[PDB]
PDB file of C-alpha atoms (C1' of nucleotides) in Angstrom:
ATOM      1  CA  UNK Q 302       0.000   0.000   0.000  1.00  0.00           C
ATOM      2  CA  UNK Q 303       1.307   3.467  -0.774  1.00  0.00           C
ATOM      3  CA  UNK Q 304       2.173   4.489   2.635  1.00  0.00           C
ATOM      4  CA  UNK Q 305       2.467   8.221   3.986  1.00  0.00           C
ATOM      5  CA  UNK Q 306       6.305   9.520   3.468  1.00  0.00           C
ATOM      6  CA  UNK Q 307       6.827  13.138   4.502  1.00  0.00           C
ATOM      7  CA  UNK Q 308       4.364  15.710   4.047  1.00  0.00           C
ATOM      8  CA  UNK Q 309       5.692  19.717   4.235  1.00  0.00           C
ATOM      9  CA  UNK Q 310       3.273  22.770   4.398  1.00  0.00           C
ATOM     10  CA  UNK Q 311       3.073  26.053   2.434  1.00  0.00           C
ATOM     11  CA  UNK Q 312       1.575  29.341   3.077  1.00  0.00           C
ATOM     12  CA  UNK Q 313      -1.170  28.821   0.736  1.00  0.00           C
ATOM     13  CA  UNK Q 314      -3.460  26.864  -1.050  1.00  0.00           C
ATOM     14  CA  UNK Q 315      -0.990  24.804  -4.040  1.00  0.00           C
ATOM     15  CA  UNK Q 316      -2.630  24.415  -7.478  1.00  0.00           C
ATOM     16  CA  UNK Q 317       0.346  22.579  -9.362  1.00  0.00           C
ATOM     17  CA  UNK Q 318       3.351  20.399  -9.174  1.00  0.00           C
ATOM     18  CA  UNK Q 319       6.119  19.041 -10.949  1.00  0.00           C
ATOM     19  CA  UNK Q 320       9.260  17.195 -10.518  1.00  0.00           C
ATOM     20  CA  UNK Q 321      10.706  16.762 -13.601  1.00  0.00           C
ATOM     21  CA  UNK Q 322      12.417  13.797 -15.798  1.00  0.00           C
ATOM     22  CA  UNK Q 323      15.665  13.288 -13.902  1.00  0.00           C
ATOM     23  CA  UNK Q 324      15.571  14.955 -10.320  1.00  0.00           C
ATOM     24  CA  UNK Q 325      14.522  15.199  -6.655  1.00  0.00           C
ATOM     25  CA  UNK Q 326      13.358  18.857  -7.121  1.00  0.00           C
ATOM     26  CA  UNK Q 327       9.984  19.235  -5.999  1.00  0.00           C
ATOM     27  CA  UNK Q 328       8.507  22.609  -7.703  1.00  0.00           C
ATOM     28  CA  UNK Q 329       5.108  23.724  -6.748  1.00  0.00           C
ATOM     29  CA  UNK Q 330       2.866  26.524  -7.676  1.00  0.00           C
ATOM     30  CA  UNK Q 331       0.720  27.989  -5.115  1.00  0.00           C
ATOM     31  CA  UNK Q 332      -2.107  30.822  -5.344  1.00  0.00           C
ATOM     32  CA  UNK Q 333      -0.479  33.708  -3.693  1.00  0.00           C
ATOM     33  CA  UNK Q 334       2.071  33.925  -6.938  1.00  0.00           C
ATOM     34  CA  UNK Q 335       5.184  32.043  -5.855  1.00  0.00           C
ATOM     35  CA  UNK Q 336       6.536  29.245  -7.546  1.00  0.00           C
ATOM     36  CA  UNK Q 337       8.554  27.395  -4.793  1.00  0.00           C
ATOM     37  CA  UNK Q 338      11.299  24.688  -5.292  1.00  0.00           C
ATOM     38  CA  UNK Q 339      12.015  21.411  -2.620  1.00  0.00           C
ATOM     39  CA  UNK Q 340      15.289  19.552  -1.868  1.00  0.00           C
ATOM     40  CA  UNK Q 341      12.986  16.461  -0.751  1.00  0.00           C
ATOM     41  CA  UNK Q 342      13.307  17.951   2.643  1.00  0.00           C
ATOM     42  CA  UNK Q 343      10.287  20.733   3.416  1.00  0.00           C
ATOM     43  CA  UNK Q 344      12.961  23.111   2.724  1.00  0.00           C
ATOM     44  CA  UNK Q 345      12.534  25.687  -0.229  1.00  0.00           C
ATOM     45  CA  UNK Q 346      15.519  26.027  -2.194  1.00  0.00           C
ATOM     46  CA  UNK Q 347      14.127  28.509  -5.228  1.00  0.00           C
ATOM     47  CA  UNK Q 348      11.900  30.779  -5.348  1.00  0.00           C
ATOM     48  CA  UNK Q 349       9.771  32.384  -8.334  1.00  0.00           C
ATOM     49  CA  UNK Q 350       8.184  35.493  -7.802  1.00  0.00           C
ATOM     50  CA  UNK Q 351       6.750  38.328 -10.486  1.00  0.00           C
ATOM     51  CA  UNK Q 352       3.354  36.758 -11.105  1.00  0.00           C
ATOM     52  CA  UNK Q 353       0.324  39.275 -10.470  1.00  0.00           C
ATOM     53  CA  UNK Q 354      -2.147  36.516  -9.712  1.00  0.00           C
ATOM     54  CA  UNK Q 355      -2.493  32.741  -8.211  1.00  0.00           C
ATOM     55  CA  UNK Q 356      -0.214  30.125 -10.035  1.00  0.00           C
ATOM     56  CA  UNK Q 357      -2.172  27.471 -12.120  1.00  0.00           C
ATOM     57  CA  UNK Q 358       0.708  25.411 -14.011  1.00  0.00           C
ATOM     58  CA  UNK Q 359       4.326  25.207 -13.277  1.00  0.00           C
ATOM     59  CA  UNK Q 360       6.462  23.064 -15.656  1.00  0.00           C
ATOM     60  CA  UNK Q 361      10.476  21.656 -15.467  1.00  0.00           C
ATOM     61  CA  UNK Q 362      12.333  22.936 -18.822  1.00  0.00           C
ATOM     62  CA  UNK Q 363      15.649  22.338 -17.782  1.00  0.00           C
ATOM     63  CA  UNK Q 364      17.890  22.330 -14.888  1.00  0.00           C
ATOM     64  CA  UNK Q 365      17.795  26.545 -15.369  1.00  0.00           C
ATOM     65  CA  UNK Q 366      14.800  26.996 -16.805  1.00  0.00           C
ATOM     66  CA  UNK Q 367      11.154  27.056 -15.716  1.00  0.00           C
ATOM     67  CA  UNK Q 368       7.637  27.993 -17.246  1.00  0.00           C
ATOM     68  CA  UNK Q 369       4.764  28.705 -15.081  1.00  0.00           C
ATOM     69  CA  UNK Q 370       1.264  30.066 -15.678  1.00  0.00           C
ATOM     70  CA  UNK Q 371      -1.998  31.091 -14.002  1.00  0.00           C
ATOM     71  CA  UNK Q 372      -5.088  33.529 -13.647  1.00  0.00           C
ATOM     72  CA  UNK Q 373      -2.812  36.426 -15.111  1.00  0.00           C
ATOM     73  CA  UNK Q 374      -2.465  36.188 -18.947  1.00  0.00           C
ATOM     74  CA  UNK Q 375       0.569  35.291 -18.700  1.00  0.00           C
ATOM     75  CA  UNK Q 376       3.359  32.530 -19.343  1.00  0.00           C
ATOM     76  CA  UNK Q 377       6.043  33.788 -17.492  1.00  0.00           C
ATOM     77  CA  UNK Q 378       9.871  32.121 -18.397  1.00  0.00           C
ATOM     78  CA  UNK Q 379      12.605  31.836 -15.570  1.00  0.00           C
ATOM     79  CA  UNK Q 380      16.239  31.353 -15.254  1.00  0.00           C
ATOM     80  CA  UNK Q 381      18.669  30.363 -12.219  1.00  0.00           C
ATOM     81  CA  UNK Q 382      22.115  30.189 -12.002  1.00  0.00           C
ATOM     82  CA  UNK Q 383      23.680  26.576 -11.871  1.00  0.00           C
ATOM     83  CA  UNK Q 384      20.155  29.639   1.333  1.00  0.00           C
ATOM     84  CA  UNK Q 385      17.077  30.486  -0.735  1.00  0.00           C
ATOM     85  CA  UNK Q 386      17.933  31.445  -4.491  1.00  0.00           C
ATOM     86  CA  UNK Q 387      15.877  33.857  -5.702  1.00  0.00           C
ATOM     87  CA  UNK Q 388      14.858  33.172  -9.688  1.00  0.00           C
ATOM     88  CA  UNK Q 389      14.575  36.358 -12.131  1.00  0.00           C
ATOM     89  CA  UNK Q 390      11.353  35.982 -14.921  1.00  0.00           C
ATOM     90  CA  UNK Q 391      13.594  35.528 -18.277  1.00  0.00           C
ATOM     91  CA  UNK Q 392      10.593  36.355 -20.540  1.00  0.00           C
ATOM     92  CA  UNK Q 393       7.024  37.107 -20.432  1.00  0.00           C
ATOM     93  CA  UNK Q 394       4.760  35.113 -22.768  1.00  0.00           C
ATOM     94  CA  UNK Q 395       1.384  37.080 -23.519  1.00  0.00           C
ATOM     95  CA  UNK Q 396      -1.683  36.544 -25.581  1.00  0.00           C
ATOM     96  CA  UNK Q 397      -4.293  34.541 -24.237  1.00  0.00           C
ATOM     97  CA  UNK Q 398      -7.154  37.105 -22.356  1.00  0.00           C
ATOM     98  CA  UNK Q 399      -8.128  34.704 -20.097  1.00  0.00           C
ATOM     99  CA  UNK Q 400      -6.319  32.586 -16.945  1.00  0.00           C
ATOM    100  CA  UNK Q 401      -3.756  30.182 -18.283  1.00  0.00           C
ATOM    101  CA  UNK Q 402      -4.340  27.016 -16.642  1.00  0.00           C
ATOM    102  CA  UNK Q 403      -2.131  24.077 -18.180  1.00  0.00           C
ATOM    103  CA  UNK Q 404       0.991  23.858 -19.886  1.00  0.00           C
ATOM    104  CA  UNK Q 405       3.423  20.939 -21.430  1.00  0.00           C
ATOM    105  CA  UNK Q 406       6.716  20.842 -22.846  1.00  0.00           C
ATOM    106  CA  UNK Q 407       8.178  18.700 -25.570  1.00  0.00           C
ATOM    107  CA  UNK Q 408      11.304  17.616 -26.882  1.00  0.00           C
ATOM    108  CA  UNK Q 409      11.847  20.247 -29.804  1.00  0.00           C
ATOM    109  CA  UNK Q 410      11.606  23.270 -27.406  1.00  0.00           C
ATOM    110  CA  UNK Q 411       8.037  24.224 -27.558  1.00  0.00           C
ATOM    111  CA  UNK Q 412       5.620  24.960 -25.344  1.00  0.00           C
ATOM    112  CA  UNK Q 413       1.290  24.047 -25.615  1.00  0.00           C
ATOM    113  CA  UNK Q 414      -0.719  26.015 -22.600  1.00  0.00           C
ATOM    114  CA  UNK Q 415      -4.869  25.774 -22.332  1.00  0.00           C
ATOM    115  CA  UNK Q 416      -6.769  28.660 -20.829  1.00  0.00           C
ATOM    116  CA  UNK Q 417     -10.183  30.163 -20.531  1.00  0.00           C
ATOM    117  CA  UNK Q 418     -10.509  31.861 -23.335  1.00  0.00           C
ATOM    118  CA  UNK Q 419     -11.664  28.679 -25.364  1.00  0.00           C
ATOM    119  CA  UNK Q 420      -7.921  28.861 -27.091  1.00  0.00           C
TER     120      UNK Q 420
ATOM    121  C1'   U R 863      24.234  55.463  -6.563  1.00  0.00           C
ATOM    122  C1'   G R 864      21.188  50.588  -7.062  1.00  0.00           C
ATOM    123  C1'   A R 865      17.553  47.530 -10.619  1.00  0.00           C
ATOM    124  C1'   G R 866      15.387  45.982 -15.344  1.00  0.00           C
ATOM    125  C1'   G R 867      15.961  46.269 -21.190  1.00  0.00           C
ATOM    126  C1'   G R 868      19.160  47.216 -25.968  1.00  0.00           C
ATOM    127  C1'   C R 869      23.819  47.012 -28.924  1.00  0.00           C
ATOM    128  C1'   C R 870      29.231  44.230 -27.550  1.00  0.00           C
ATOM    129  C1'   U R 871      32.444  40.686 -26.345  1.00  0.00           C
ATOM    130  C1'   U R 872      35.209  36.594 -23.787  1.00  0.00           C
ATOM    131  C1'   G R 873      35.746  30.874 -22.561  1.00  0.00           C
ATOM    132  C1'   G R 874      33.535  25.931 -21.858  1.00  0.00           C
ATOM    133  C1'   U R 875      29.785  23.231 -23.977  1.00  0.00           C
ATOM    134  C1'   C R 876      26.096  20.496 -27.340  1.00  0.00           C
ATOM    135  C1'   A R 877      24.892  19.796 -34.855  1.00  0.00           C
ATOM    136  C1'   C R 878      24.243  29.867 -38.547  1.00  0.00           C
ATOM    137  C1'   G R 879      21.305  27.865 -33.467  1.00  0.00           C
ATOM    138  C1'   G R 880      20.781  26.314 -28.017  1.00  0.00           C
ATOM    139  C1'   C R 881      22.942  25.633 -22.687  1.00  0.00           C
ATOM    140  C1'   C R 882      26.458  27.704 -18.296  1.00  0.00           C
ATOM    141  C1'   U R 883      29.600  31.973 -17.095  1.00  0.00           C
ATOM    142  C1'   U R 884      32.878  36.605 -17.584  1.00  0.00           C
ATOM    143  C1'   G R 885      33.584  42.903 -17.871  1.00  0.00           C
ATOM    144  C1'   G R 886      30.274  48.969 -20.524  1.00  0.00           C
ATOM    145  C1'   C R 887      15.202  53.522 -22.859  1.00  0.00           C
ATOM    146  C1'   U R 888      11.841  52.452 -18.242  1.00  0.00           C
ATOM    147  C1'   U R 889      12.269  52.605 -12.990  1.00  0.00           C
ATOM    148  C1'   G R 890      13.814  52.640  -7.474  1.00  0.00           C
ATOM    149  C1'   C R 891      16.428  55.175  -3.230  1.00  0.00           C
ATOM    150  C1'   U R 892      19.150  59.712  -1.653  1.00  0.00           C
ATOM    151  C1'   A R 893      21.446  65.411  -2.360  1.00  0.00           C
ATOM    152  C1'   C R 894      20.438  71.209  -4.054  1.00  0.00           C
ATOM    153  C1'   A R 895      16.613  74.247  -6.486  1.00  0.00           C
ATOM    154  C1'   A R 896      10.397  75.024  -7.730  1.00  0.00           C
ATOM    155  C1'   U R 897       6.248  75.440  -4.904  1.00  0.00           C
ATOM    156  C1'   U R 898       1.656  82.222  -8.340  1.00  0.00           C
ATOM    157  C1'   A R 899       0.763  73.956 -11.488  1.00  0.00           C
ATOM    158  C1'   A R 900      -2.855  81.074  -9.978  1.00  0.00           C
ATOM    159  C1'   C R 901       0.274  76.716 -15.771  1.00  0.00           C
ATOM    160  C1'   G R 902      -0.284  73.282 -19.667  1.00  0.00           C
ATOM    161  C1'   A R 903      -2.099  68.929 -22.279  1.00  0.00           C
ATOM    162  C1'   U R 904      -5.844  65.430 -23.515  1.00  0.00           C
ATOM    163  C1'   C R 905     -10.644  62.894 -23.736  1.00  0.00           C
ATOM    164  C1'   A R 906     -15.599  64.101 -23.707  1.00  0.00           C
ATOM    165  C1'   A R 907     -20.235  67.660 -24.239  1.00  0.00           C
ATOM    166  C1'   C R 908     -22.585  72.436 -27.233  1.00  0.00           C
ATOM    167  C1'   U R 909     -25.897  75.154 -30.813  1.00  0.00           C
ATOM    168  C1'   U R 910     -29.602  81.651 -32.672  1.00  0.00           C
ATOM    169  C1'   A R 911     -36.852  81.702 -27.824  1.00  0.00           C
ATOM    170  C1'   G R 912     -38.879  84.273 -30.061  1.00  0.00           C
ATOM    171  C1'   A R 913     -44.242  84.995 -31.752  1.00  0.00           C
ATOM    172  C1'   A R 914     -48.556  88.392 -33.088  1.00  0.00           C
ATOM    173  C1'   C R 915     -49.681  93.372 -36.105  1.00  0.00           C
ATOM    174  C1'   U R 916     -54.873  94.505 -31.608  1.00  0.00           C
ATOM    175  C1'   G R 917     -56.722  98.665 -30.506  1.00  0.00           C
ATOM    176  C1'   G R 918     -58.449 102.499 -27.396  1.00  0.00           C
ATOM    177  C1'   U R 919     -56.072 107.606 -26.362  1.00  0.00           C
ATOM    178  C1'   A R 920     -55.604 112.934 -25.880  1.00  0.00           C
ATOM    179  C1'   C R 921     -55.863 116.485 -30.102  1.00  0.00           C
ATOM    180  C1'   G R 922     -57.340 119.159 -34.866  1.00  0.00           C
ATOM    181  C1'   G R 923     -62.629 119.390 -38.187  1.00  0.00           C
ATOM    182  C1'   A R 924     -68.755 118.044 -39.585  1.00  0.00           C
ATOM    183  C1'   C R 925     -73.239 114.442 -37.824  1.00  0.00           C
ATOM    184  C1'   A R 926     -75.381 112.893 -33.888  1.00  0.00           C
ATOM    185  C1'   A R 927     -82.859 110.880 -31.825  1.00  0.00           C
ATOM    186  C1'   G R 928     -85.074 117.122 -32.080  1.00  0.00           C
ATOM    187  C1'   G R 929     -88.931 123.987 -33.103  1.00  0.00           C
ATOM    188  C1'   G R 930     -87.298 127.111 -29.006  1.00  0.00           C
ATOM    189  C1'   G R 931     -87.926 131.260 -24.740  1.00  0.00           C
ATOM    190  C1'   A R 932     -90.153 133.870 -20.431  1.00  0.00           C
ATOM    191  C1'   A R 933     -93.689 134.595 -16.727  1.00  0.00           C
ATOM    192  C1'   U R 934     -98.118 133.447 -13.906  1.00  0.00           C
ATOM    193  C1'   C R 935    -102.188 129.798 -11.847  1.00  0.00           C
ATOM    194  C1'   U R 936    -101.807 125.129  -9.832  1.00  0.00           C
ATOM    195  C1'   G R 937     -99.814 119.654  -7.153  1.00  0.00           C
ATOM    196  C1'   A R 938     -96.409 117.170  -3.682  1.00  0.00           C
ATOM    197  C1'   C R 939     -92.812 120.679  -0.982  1.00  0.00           C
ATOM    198  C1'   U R 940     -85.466 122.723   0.395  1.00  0.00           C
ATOM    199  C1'   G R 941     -81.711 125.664   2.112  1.00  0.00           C
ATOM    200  C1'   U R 942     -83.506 132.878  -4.320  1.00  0.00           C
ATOM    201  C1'   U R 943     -87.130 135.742  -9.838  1.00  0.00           C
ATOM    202  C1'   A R 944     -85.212 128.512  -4.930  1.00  0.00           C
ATOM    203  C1'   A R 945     -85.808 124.116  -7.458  1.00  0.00           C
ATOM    204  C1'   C R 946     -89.410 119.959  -9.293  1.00  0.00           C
ATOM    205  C1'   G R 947     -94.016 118.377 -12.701  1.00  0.00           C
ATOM    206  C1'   A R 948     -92.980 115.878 -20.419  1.00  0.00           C
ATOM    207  C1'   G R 949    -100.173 119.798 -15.071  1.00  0.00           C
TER     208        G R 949
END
RNA sequence: UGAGGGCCUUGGUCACGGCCUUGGCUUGCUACAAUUAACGAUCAACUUAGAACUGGUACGGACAAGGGGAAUCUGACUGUUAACGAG
């Protein structure tokens, strides 16, 4: 049976996750607007801040790189640099008019989000 | 003097293009003036309410119903030949 691990709070309600292909990086979304990374641990070792709204969607690019989403219309790409590290928003992806709720990456480097606005 | 963008560039890395690093228009915090911004800019609102041409007025010049005047007698009856009566 899958038995009960660890379990470490946030300040807010979360709304995503994601770990990634090959890591132990826990990254989690939550609806104040901060995109926080875990060592496995309850300890945050990243955070992503720069988002107007809640989070929806976070996603694992690379080892540097992260794309998250949510009710601003907004994809919102962030570096680090490979205590608490404190990520900078690389690029801002806009277009959609309503909250951004999902996103996916693929192998060729692109990017497929779903929002509200039936798009 | 800190931040974010733009043009540069230096090495390692993966078949002109990614990944990791190196040094040089917007806004944030402080210092001296201005506080007659009592100024300027921009968006938005706004069109001409006037109609009618009635009469009576004071004045200037002819009509206006139609024979007049005076006094006595007489009939109800005041304050100067009193008046009045379709006698």
């Amino acid at each position: 049976p899958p038995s009960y691990l660890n379990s470490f709070s946030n300040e807010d309600w979360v709304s995503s996750l994601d770990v990634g292909d090959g890591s132990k990086h826990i990254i989690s979304g939550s609806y104040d607007g901060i995109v926080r990374t875990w060592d496995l641990s309850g300890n945050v070792q990243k955070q992503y801040s720069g988002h107007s709204g809640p989070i929806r969607a976070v996603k694992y690019i690379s080892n540097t790189r992260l794309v998250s989403a949510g009710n601003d219309r907004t994809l919102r790409l962030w570096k680090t640099k490979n205590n608490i590290e404190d990520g900078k928003t690389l690029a801002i992806l806009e277009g959609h008019k309503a909250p951004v709720v999902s996103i996916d990456v693929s192998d060729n480097s692109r990017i497929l989000s779903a929002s509200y606005d039936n798009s």
